[PDB]
Amino acid sequence: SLLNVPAGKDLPEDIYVVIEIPANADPIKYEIDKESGALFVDRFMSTAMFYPCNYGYINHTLSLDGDPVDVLVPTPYPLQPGSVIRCRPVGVLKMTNEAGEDAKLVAVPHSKLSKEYDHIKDVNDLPELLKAQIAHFFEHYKDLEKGKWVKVEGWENAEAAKAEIVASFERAKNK
Amino acid sequence: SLLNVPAGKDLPEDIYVVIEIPANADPIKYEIDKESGALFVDRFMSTAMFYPCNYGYINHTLSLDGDPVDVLVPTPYPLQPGSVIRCRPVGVLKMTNEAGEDAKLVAVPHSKLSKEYDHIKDVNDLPELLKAQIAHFFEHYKDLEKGKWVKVEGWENAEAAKAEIVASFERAKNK
Amino acid sequence: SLLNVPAGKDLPEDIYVVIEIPANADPIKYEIDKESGALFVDRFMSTAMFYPCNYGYINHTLSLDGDPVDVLVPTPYPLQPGSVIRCRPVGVLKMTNEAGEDAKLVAVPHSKLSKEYDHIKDVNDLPELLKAQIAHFFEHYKDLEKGKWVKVEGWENAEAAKAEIVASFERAKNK
Amino acid sequence: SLLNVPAGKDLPEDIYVVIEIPANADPIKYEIDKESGALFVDRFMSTAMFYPCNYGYINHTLSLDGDPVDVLVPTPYPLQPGSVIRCRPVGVLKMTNEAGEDAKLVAVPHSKLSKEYDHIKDVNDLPELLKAQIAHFFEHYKDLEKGKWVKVEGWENAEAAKAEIVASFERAKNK
Amino acid sequence: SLLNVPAGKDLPEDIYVVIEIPANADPIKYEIDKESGALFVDRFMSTAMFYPCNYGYINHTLSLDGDPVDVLVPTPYPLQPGSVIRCRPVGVLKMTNEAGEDAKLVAVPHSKLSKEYDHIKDVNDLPELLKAQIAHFFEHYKDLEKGKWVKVEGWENAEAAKAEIVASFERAKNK
Amino acid sequence: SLLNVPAGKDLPEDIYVVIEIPANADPIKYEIDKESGALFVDRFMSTAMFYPCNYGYINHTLSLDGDPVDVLVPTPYPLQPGSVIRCRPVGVLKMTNEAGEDAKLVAVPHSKLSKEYDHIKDVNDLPELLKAQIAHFFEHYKDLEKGKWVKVEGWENAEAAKAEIVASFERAKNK
Numbered sequence A, B, C, D, E, F: 001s002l003l004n005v006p007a008g009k010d011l012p013e014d015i016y017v018v019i020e021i022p023a024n025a026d027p028i029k030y031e032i033d034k035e036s037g038a039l040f041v042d043r044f045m046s047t048a049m050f051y052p053c054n055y056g057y058i059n060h061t062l063s064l065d066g067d068p069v070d071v072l073v074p075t076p077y078p079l080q081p082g083s084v085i086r087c088r089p090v091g092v093l094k095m096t097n098e099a100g101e102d103a104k105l106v107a108v109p110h111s112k113l114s115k116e117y118d119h120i121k122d123v124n125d126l127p128e129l130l131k132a133q134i135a136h137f138f139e140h141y142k143d144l145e146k147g148k149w150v151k152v153e154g155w156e157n158a159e160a161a162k163a164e165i166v167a168s169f170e171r172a173k174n175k
Helices: A128-140 A158-172 B128-140 B158-172 C128-140 C158-172 D128-140 D158-172 E128-140 E158-172 F128-140 F158-172
Strands: A015-021 A028-032 A039-044 A054-057 A070-073 A083-097 A104-109 A151-156 B015-021 B028-032 B039-044 B054-057 B070-073 B083-097 B104-109 B151-156 C015-021 C028-032 C039-044 C054-057 C070-073 C083-097 C104-109 C151-156 D015-021 D028-032 D039-044 D054-057 D070-073 D083-097 D104-109 D151-156 E015-021 E028-032 E039-044 E054-057 E070-073 E083-097 E104-109 E151-156 F015-021 F028-032 F039-044 F054-057 F070-073 F083-097 F104-109 F151-156
Touching: A015 A028, A015 A070, A070 A083, A083 A128, A083 A158, A104 A128, A104 A158, A128 A151, A128 E128, B015 B028, B015 B070, B070 B083, B083 B128, B083 B158, B104 B128, B104 B158, B128 B151, B128 D128, C015 C028, C015 C070, C070 C083, C083 C128, C083 C158, C104 C128, C104 C158, C128 C151, C128 F128, D015 D028, D015 D070, D070 D083, D083 D128, D083 D158, D104 D128, D104 D158, D128 D151, E015 E028, E015 E070, E070 E083, E083 E128, E083 E158, E104 E128, E104 E158, E128 E151, F015 F028, F015 F070, F070 F083, F083 F128, F083 F158, F104 F128, F104 F158, F128 F151
Parallel strands: A039 B083, A070 A104, A083 C039, B039 C083, B070 B104, C070 C104, D039 E083, D070 D104, D083 F039, E039 F083, E070 E104, F070 F104
Antiparallel strands: A015 A054, A015 A083, A028 A039, A054 A070, A083 A104, A083 A151, B015 B054, B015 B083, B028 B039, B054 B070, B083 B104, B083 B151, C015 C054, C015 C083, C028 C039, C054 C070, C083 C104, C083 C151, D015 D054, D015 D083, D028 D039, D054 D070, D083 D104, D083 D151, E015 E054, E015 E083, E028 E039, E054 E070, E083 E104, E083 E151, F015 F054, F015 F083, F028 F039, F054 F070, F083 F104, F083 F151
16 A cells, blocks of 8 residues: 555655655645545645645654645656655745644655756755745645635755654654 | 545535546546456447546445446546545436446535535536536447447436435445 | 456456556656555656557566566557556567566457457557557667666567466466 | 648649647537638537547538538547648548538548558548447537537448549639 | 637627637747737746636737737637637726736637536626636736736626727727 | 748847747647648657657748758747747757758747746756757657668757858848
8 A cells, every 4th residue: 555655765865755746737636545545635726726846745754733744846747646756855845824834845856766856955956946936836825715824934955854854754653 | 445435424415436537538437446446447438438527436335236336526627546535416317227227426526625516406506518418428428339228317316316325325234 | 456456367368467657658667566556656767758558567477587577558548557457468579678588568458348459369460560669669768778778689479478478477476 | 821721732642631620639629710711619519529530621622511521530649720631531421410411531641641541541441440439429429419410321432532522622613 | 810810790799719828728828929920939937827717819909008808718628729719708807917907808608609608697607716716816827927016906797898898999990 | 920930039049939849749740831831740750759849940041951940949838839939049969861961959948938948058058868868869769760860960059059040041041
């Protein structure tokens, strides 16, 4: 099952992200259910907005807000929902919604899948336009969602990204 | 697995439909296998016809013809094969093929995924064109299938739809 | 799971192929992981090339090179990653990479899915253009892959294809 | 403009078809307007049906029903609306709607675009399934169109197809 | 050419909209050039946003801001860039950018293309969600465009929509 | 028409490329016809290869081999056949086929469409992978084309690219 995917080969620099939502997809937000492992429809987003990158989670991790660390994963072509990609974390985008702190890591395909992301070691190496586009996306994608709201605190580095993976991996191994 | 998906949170008005065939897809008819839970090719349909809605089934249900209640689920964007959507039943389309009675429910996305279908409580609230299109589809999609044939008896209401879900859920819990 | 799919109903003439890569897809090479059964990204291919047919494997088989018999499966429309298709083997394309012998069978949809492939009994009945296109594909798709290289030895018949399925099925039942 | 496209290089065996509707497209019926040459929406078809082949017309031709000879053009990949393909006529499908006689030729890509259709010289060489699929399509695509109706008289040979191109080309050069 | 398309058959209730940008398309903003009639790239929008409807213009019209009346045209399936659709105006969305007043009409497919929009006579009959989605789109699609900015004044009725078509058609016939 | 598109606003650094083939498209090679301006099918390529970038030509230019300077134009999303993009030339890929010298320029979207390509001034600033992918493509896309063959001489700089645009623009204004 998707529930038995390792967190990574070598955490926190060598991790697996379970893809839930492909880059550039229609605006359906899917979630792996932690009970069945199946792909569930969470909602049909009301804005005319698309995820700017592939969107998923690291298995066996528990972020401060009670669920797995979310990850955005840029790729030359959109991935399949339910596929697992080997990645390297490179950066984190801090935000608050109406559940508190909810960081989104950014991680690039690992060098064994591809050499293309090898120049990207830290948050400053991501294209400006891509960072601006991502932030705008999480700023606005819920604008028409009555019970929901989001505030974007800003970008941090790969070491802040890694420390979140370790803290969330440890917290899953007790709680 | 897809085999451990509940029938619904609150049957028969609050159910889960396991998607097998997306709206507007190429004409490949897929089926979840009840042994592995994998998505199997059932056939390559010979007509130049597409499913007018997403097409799947309610798990843990057994309809008179020896398999799960089939459901059609209209959505603003096509869903992924193997995804689970939370829905409300709204209507039923009665038909006979060469296995007897084989109803197809129609159910709309539940209000928690979306407000868009909230005005649709019963069969009369579905667009005319959509009902006519669906009926035409099941009338004709097998026209070129030598061993197979279909007759479309007509539309019934949400209460007829719900009573089929309850009767099929009970029959799965003994047979 | 995909790990409990039978090898076929009646080997070697009646087999199941687990689809990993759809015909005409973006150039992402996916692999079912034999540990979780999930779909994993293996790499982002560097050539501007697409798989000319659907690409997968027969479960419960072990080819000389330490993994399941690979299969190419032509279909009127591209299949979904992780779907299982019932097929008949019709031919085999022999090649060496930097792991030795790595045949790729060709198999067509079985007559119960479709009548369209029924005229194809053996390797000579496949369109010339399709065989030439496939061979060119495996010749070149790795051209830009530093550690990797491929040589295409040529086409053999359905009986050579079947004997490989039997030898690989037997070898999985001991090793 | 599309209005200055020749009828063919060497009529009736070497012709140009102006594409209006791609194979496998959403069910929007487009028409080149003979006044502007622009692509106009003619209607949104109500059936869940797709054109089984690319659909267009031969320029400078006038069929008995007051407009250009319609052509269906099978191709390995769908064409762009408004593109011109060089073809060879191979067959004709006779029908009546509520304007009388309205044949649809079938023509395959000419050998200079492709060798793939070179084995198809006459109507008997087209796949059975394709002929059956096309006929079913024109039989039914208007079923839900109140003012409209279609009857399918059947298949004729390449020489009947060519004689229609010549008669329609001559009739355009007087009327 | 697209430059010789009439404004409508019977203005202002029966008009032609020249499509420039399909509903749900990648975020490339195209423009017909009034010199050649060709489709030109105007820019690659920086937001992760899609046009919620098809987007074009009425030919032979000049709006206060020095170019043709812009129109949004909802359709069951996305249209082709450069296609002409027959529509009925139903409503107008008023806004200011850094060129002043720049209304966008909404118009639905005319009854001869389709019966589906026949219930929509005025702005109040458009789905709420669709109006909210459109307004959000024009509010935000330029957020990352340095020299550009937009303010959304709100919705007006079909009679306000028609009077704009007449005033813009008259102004094109002198200026 | 597409025949009246200028060569550029300010040649050779500010040019218009007429798109013929979108990035990542099915393998149909289209050509604008210089007689009608329509999009013609030139052939259905036999390899399983896709154009790695959008592919078109500069109007009013005549390259040594008797037709317009060909251009490859990388873009965040694939363009429409027959659209015109404003670009800046950045590099040239020299090759011989069986008509002699047939350079392909590379040009990026001009800064007014987008800021994304602004860091790319010369051939060395294009991603390595992209240059390698393009060269591999023109090396191999004709491998199965009996009468045709291609040899790839290599990359030159923006000044070599510009001098070709000027020489080809001058040669069109006499010959």
